[PDB]
Amino acid sequence: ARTVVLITGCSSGIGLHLAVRLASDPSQSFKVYATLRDLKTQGRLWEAARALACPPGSLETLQLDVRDSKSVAAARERVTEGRVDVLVCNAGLGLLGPLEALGEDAVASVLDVNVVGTVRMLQAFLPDMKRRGSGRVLVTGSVGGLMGLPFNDVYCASKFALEGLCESLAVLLLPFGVHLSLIECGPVHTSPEEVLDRTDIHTFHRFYQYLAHSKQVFREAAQNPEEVAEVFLTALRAPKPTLRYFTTERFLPLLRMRLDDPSGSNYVTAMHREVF
Amino acid sequence: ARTVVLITGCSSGIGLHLAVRLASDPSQSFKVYATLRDLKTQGRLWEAARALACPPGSLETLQLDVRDSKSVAAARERVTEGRVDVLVCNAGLGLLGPLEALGEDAVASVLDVNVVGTVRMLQAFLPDMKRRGSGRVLVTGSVGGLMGLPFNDVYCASKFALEGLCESLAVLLLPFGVHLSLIECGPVHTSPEEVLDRTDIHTFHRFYQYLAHSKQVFREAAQNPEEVAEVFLTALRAPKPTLRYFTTERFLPLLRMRLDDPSGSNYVTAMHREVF
Numbered sequence: 385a386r387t388v389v390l391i392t393g394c395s396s397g398i399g400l401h402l403a404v405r406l407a408s409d410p411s412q413s414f415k416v417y418a419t420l421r422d423l424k425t426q427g428r429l430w431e432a433a434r435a436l437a438c439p440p441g442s443l444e445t446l447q448l449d450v451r452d453s454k455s456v457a458a459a460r461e462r463v464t465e466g467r468v469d470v471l472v473c474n475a476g477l478g479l480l481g482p483l484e485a486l487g488e489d490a491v492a493s494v495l496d497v498n499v500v501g502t503v504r505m506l507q508a509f510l511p512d513m514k515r516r517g518s519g520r521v522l523v524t525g526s527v528g529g530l531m532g533l534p535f536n537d538v539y540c541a542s543k544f545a546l547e548g549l550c551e552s553l554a555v556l557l558l559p560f561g562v563h564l565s566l567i568e569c570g571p572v573h574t575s576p577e578e579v580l581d582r583t584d585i586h587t588f589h590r591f592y593q594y595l596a597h598s599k600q601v602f603r604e605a606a607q608n609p610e611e612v613a614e615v616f617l618t619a620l621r622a623p624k625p626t627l628r629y630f631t632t633e634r635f636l637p638l639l640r641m642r643l644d645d646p647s648g649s650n651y652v653t654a655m656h657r658e659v660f
Numbered sequence: 661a662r663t664v665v666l667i668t669g670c671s672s673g674i675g676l677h678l679a680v681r682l683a684s685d686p687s688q689s690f691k692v693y694a695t696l697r698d699l700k701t702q703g704r705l706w707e708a709a710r711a712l713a714c715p716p717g718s719l720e721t722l723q724l725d726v727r728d729s730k731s732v733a734a735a736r737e738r739v740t741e742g743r744v745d746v747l748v749c750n751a752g753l754g755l756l757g758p759l760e761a762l763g764e765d766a767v768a769s770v771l772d773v774n775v776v777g778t779v780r781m782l783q784a785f786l787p788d789m790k791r792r793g794s795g796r797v798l799v800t801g802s803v804g805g806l807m808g809l810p811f812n813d814v815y816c817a818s819k820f821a822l823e824g825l826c827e828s829l830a831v832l833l834l835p836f837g838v839h840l841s842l843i844e845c846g847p848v849h850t851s852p853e854e855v856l857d858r859t860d861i862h863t864f865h866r867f868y869q870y871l872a873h874s875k876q877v878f879r880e881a882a883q884n885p886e887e888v889a890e891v892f893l894t895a896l897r898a899p900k901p902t903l904r905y906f907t908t909e910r911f912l913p914l915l916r917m918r919l920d921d922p923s924g925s926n927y928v929t930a931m932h933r934e935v936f
């Protein structure tokens with residue numbers, strides 16, 4: 385039988401690229417349920433699917449909004465095979481700006497989608513995997529869940545939360561045969577007036593500096609989503625997958641500095657200088 | 661003038677002990693606003709305050725429920741001095757059990773109180789600190805925000821989120837004169853039928869094992885809250901405070917193992933063996 389994959393957030397970026405990479409695999413090993421918060425956004429996915437000649441029936445789209453457990457449960461029921469071999473929790477939101485300029489609703493949304501939405505997926509799909517003694521869970525991670533980034537406080541909070549969620553689950557899941565892995569990505573190729581009204585002029589200036597620095601890092605280091613999507617495939621095919629896969633080695637040095645001074649002083653100084 | 665301190669979650673545990681330690685300081689240097697989600701729980705705080713002979717006016721209680729920005733803003737307005745020198749974000753919730761047995765509401769609450777509630781406090785109080793070029797923010801942290809613990813998936817998610825939140829803020833706040841620090845605590849001295857209905861028998865058994873192990877760690881290693889509260893004082897008086905203070909060195913070895921194998925495999929195996 386085919387490996388059934390269900391992926392969240394497939395309208396663009398990594399989830400879209402992974403869905404068509406799997407559905408178009410030359411071996412035809414995978415059946416992919418590409419889920420999207422809003423089905424009106426499915427056009428790029430189908431344009432990409434056609435461009436890679438995904439065979440008819442290799443790819444199916446479902447509406448699945450991870451903020452609603454009813455949407456999660458209805459998409460689970462639509463899996464005609466009655467099982468999910470590979471669950472990919474990829475749906476996510478960014479949030480950028482001075483902490484005091486972020487709306488309360490925008491903050492709550494990032495946490496609900498990024499964190500509670502993955503909890504909702506794991507509650508809905510983990511129990512069947514545990515009973516079967518098999519299944520693979522891949523979660524899209526970020527360098528921002530491993531080290532704090534200025535002006536990405538809430539986004540980072542959310543990615544760090546996924547690290548804690550997944551590591552805690554991994555400790556239990558070790559002898560169940562169910563494998564969880566984070567795919568740690570760096571940058572991937574996928575109004576000033578309102579921010580200034582909500583913060584001070586110095587923070588606003590630092591924000592500009594962050595943004596100029598971010599643009600340069602992206603221009604120099606953003607990876608193609610095909611390259612990132614393939615790390616998911618690598619994790620899927622490992623007989624004994626590790627908790628974390630890194631899509632690049634570029635941030636490891638910073639990571640090691642961070643990890644080697646538990647007071648946090650070396651990291652805070654080094655990252656302040658790197659960005660500003 | 662006195663150092664004005666506002667602390668969240670003062671009904672018991674660390675926040676209660678810190679509030680009276682500060683209010684009763686022999687130098688009478690601090691004016692403490694001890695805030696509590698529900699004022700009906702203030703009795704132990706006042707019993708402790710009397711036992712340490714806090715001078716009249718050294719300690720004041722305000723209702724402050726970090727889930728509501730209106731409650732945050734009304735308590736801020738009650739600070740008669742018009743400034744907060746030291747803000748202590750300590751309010752928190754635990755959540756223990758099999759991930760599939762946790763209510764959706766209980767999950768959302770842990771994140772809203774532990775993460776969005778600290779964001780709400782920082783939005784309300786950081787701007788005045790930044791304008792003044794001074795102020796200290798202390799956040800109660802946990803060993804669970806530094807490494808994942810089985811059956812504490814959502815709690816850990818929330819503590820890891822605070823690490824990401826605070827580290828991201830610290831990178832920006834470096835040149836503003838506003839100091840943020842996490843106080844990293846280990847264990848501190850502060851129905852089966854329903855869990856079994858929501859999970860499988862094997863997970864339920866592992867849960868028992870976790871709980872027996874947890875009880876032994878607590879019995880052997882829980883620190884007195886006076887000792888933990890004093891680390892907050894240490895951070896407050898440091899001229900150049902670090903991002904993190906540890907209340908104990910007991911988990912550093914585990915922390916270093918975790919940090920030295922970024923694949924996460926060594927930690928997951930070691931912690932599985934430690935608990936089970």
Ligand SMILES: NC(=O)c1ccc[n+]([C@@H]2O[C@H](COP(=O)([O-])OP(=O)(O)OC[C@H]3O[C@@H](n4cnc5c(N)ncnc54)[C@H](OP(=O)(O)O)[C@@H]3O)[C@@H](O)[C@H]2O)c1
Pocket residue numbers: 392393394395396397398399420421422425448449450451474475476477497524525526527568569570571572573574
């Ligand atoms: N791109 C990078 O530089 C980078 C780096 C490290 C990690 N990552 C991670 O990669 C994942 C995918 O992002 P991309 O692939 O990089 O970026 P992307 O295009 O932002 O992908 C995110 C996907 O999540 C979906 N989504 C948002 N809210 C959702 C909800 N409530 N329910 C279901 N789906 C929802 C988005 O769709 P709608 O917009 O239609 O809601 C979009 O399809 C994210 O978890 C992101 O954090 C990205």
Ligand SMILES: NC(=O)c1ccc[n+]([C@@H]2O[C@H](COP(=O)([O-])OP(=O)(O)OC[C@H]3O[C@@H](n4cnc5c(N)ncnc54)[C@H](OP(=O)(O)O)[C@@H]3O)[C@@H](O)[C@H]2O)c1
Pocket residue numbers: 668669670671672673674675696697698701724725726727750751752753773800801802803844845846847848849850
């Ligand atoms: N105790 C440990 O073993 C340990 C270890 C590491 C870190 N910590 C951290 O220490 C902090 C304090 O806990 P303790 O001091 O250890 O435990 P605690 O007695 O649980 O303290 C938590 C305080 O948070 C309050 N709280 C809960 N929801 C709130 C809300 N919505 N608004 C305002 N306050 C709220 C609680 O009051 P109500 O119950 O009345 O809401 C209580 O006063 C927590 O952040 C905890 O994670 C504890």
